[PDB]
């Protein structure tokens, strides 16, 4: 598992890899590791179970709605119950998520952590991504789309848990 | 141990190995791996202790009365639940299931997984059954029963904990 | 790493996988892990350490020219100095050897294997691959070759150490 | 693997599986793990590699001809120079030996065995063989054939590394 | 530890050993492991511990008044307190019970199992039993006590285990 | 540790060492590890921790005031007590006990025994004062107290983590 | 295995069992652990593979004629040459050795130990029959081979790798 | 340890950090690990001990002498002898050489590979580098010197046993 | 990781690495692992998760409000709760903690410690810091401040898990 | 850590090493491990946790105060609470204390014990203090301080966990 | 262990602790871990078993003879040989050399290192001493003797396997 999310030019994206691995077997190859939130202005990304992060991501947005949206007062509200709830500490999972404001990352620790340039590369193909992207966002003039898009191909390569189907949610503020 | 569920022209199976392996010995040769559940709507599968099956299946149609017998939404709530009670977590088992809807996969780490033509696969024999699942689905017409015969078979010949028992119970819905 | 040979119609192929991994990582991914030995004569394979594999296919051909080509009785010799010597007992490879005569494994444990209909399947993604070239072997009229590619290509899509990248060296005969 | 030999009414057999496993996949259900030897006088069974028995069958019988056919002096020959040489030192099987003056058994480690009633079971399997075979040759009137063949079919049922493939060598003297 | 059970001719018995182990030591070679239940009308076994046995013995009874004697739904219903009581799964045993209906096995997983032909084999040397169980019930026309017996002191001489005190209790129903 | 009990003409013994071990080390010479319960009419020795056994020696006088001071039936329920409570399955000892009517083991696996001859012999050097009092028992007309007391002293002769101090608690009935 | 020699009135002795124990299961329970050397003046035995005894019985036979019999002497050069040769070493057994002179045992780890009373038990039962003959040899007048054989028998009562089946062979000197 | 060659527009180079790691602790900081061979004609570097690559270079660089400077035929000799001999066999290092010609890598299991685009990436930060060599040189026309530094850089951000000392040694071919 | 807490003239500092390593990967290079408590009268460092500390140092703040701000007896406050409760347990960290009255570590374990000179060196690189604090603090005239500077940057020159991003939060009291 | 207690002439001690280890680093060097309790009548020593011992303290004075100072009945209800309390079974040290009626330890297992001369002596290098104090109180007319000093002493110079850091609390009586 | 090396003002040092550790116990405090080569021109020192480093420093004498007293070269030499023979390659120490041309350190590994400003900390203590002896040589005028020393002492005060038994050896070039 791979996942990516840079921030450039008045934009950000985030993108992930397919691959369910079972072992040394592949599970499944079209997983949709990325989804929106909170109506459409917010974008997210998981490596771990399926369902362990469709129960963090809705209460991720109920935590957006008490704080009105803050990304990063609901990601510490969210860090904070996943690492107390007796429930909650069971799941095993890492998040990423971002909005027009900025991007971070979310683990089962309780620890909330943004990256240097919003730059998150998460999962076991996580620092191959890092290094592709760090790369490319110093060296050329490519847009974050871009960026993430090839940067999660080179994970796929090396990675032998993450293979080269993509899901991408762009978000535009500009 | 190997179960496999192919959906083709509007029918769907489960079939599974009835080798129960104590070490190196067989302990019993005609396990019932395959049962119906939600009043004959569905079809489901387990790798495992045969009461944790019993506990999971029972508790999935319980989850499936407050969904309507929505499948997916269902499978979730009893992923959650398996991961998250302290009881349900000793739990070891692999659950396959599937309706007129579609086939998907369940796990004691909570994960929900739907294969990509909805063709399960799982036990030790699990990727064995897998691969000759996959050839006879794209170069022949078989029908979903024919195949998940054939392929069970296949998969006793190579894994040593699969034996040529077989249980299925198929759905047609047309 | 997967290996496939198929013998039908007087043709007998013999196709691997290209990928090399360390650990989590893929190191080479187009590998030769099929080669001809013996004058154009035979084909063969292995799964391991590229040089491990080359000391002891120059040896094969050693033992075929004291034995005139015969390959079983080549294939002994081998096995037998291959658990003798301390020095080729330090190797670690599977062999995979076929000619019109018939089709064999060869291991570091001495011991001299010829499947069922000379179908041949090793590597960690063997077990895959044979359970797909024995589903297509019964059930299609396919060409040897047609049926080994087909099944190193699903061993590919299950194994995370199996890629892509095919080699193949048929021989024909009739 | 087992194999089984019994000897009753002047006759003795020679019986064994022809499964071949690795790891957890079946390599090959087909194996002769029985055969004649010193000129259709001896018959012997092998638990390893094939190519390993090859090498101490044929030594063997140059054994039975520095001492003229006596089972017992040749069979501590070879258990002298399979201990003592660093060639066969190496060589890791489960001989099994016959013929009209007695049965024994022939290991690694240099020990030559007789069992209390020439009754010999070895191999994964070979205590299960031993527990049926003890119970029809005490109870029953039944040849050592039928009984060898039906312990045989019986250690294949409970063995997971023992299937119903058999191959006998009868010794009639009478 | 072994227990036996086998019915034939209107009769089914259980037979156990009386071997009480402690890491290499023979703690008790007397132990009665076979006794008789609800009113004289059925017959049990167990591999474990004592107390943990007569503990699940006295609740079975009580799942039979409640359930009139109807073994299988008693059997159920003890298995289901089993695994769900904190307090019961703590209990580490294997039970044999049988009555003139049917012959099952109970587990600490909640398992309830009938046999083939019901013929039970638990215990550290229950393969070796069932070995010689299924050679004589198919080969001759012993009575189920004879059977019991002959393949109870067949395990004693395999299993370190298992010793040759005998314990058996009939039940005639013909 | 060693503890010896022994039962001969009216009388009943129970001898322990003194040595505490820590690794390698002698902790404590002189340790009690024998002493009386209700009332005086009850002797026991246990191997382990000494509070470990303080608790469980106070919660068996509990049992014996609920039973009347029936040895097997308090026994049972302490069994069933300590493997059950979530604390006491913590305490790790083997308990000695013994009266007028009968001697018996208890354990922390809830198993509760009674040697053949009311012979107990428990701790590392349990099975060396165990074959020591066995060939006294048969052999010569001495007391239980000589008994016991000669056959610690070859125990700690033998055992290193023995030692020759020793406490004895008789009770004479007649 | 067990392993007893006594000494006693001008006689010495020297008794073993037959039990050869293979994981759980019984080999072999007429193993002859039990032999004579040097022209029948000195008896020994062994606790370990058969062939590993007769390998180093012989060479202390040698050592013997180039010492002129002398017993301690060779068995130094014996323990001397175990631990130093690289094939030697690789041999693991347990020997003990007696003639009208002295008892002593032999171990790999190049020791030579002569006990208290010439009195040697060795083997997993070793301690047992220690403490047993201990007990007789003390409080007794019988003879060492009533000794032996009676301390061998409760060995195999308590060890689960000792049997009953007895092999003797008395010197006397006087 | 990380080093990087790139071969782009008729140049080739190869840079290598500089740390040389001790357990957790930093031993030296500027270590050299490329060099210069033949007369000025070959770049390489190395991963492991330094007299290790040392023997290795010096005997590259003969049989350079005996081959004319032919690369890839050298790289063979060089990787023959050190598998074969058994004083190269212990060496432990992982070498990287290139000229005009290309561009390989050698190691100590004999193994000669040549990267898909002459891009090698070996050490503990080795697959860090091969990740953002691979982005730069598709996505820009940056000089191989240029994307080697970038992508040493990178290595030593992520890996923790590579540093920012660098060492670069560029063959200008056109 | 590595923590650093230094006092001299009034003055007393607490610095700390910015290195946040996953396995041979750098994770984050500029955690900031100090922090300020208790309304700006108290200092703080922590080496294991973040969200880790942030319980235990909000639990602190806490403990000194029952306190007074007494540093040492809510040190032990929170060492005792630390050990005690079932949810802190699981916590995996190490603080370090000052104010103008004394520096002080606090461990998982319960530890409550106040180095020689109030100089505390924590983390992978606690130890390289101590010595280089040591030799500074007795050999110079520098203040706390240059000197836990200093020391940090040796120990992330020498440890691999520690790096140069500082983050410091001094105290005067004079 | 080394502690120790020697009674003598009316006279009794308790000292104590300062020595804090953290893995295999040096924490603090004067630490306290000895203090005095109970208004000044009481002298105690702790191996452990700071913090842990200073709970245990506390409440070992208030058993004092309900059983109006006896040592004895106090230690017993200190180890009654600490075995069975949740909380205090997370404490984990050794307590050693005295007064002018005896001296005993107390262990976290509830374990009371007075040593035979009431020598205490715990700690890694405990053992090694015991055996130089049990020498001088044998062979000298040294007071009770000079024993337990010199014996301090020896410890630290063969620990390497004590150091030579005291501190002592005496007791006169006479 | 702990050893020094520091070169400053036209005098280099070595020196070391003495202490040897077996376990947890301190073996001998006043060994001689530095000693002189090569007719007073060498100074070395090492970390290990003390017979293996006099026979590194002896061959090592012998490869500056070949040499003529060059250090480099003769260290590769030394090294060569080290991890080749495979007598040599069984010994495990850590060295340490100097001469008036520069400092280095040899591994078993083959590995040649000299450090940044010739400064060598080895030894269990190593890391301990080159963060003081760092923090000194940058802000003191102290010459490499005092330096050493100092340091010395620190890793004894840090290190518990490091004492503060000193051997030094000076050698002055200017």
């Known amino acids: 598992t791979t996942i990516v999310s840079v921030r450039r030019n008045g ?27 909170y109506n459409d202005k917010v974008i997210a990304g998981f ?10 991501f809705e209460l991720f947005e109920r935590k ?21 709830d ?11 998520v971002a909005d027009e404001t900025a ?20 999962g076991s193909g996580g620092p191959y991504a890092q290094a592709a992207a760090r790369a490319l966002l110093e060296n050329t003039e490519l847009s974050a789309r871009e960026i993430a898009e090839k940067a999660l191909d080179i994970a796929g390569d090396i990675c032998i848990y993450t293979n080269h189907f993509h899901t991408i949610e762009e978000l535009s503020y500009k």
């Open 47 to 56: 490596a771990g179970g399926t369902a362990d992060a469709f129960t963090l």
């Open 103 to 122: 991007s971070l990352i979310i683990t089962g620790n309780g620890d909330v952590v943004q990256p240097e340039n919003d730059l998150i590369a998460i």
């Open 64 to 84: 957006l709605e008490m704080h009105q949206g803050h990304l990063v007062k609901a990601a510490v509200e969210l860090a904070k119950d996943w690492r107390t």
């Open 11 to 37: 934009h950000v994206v985030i993108a992930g890899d397919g691959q369910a691995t079972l072992g040394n077997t592949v599970m499944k190859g079209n997983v949709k590791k990325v989804r929106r939130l």
């Open 86 to 96: 007796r429930m909650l500490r069971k799941l095993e999972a890492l998040l990423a």
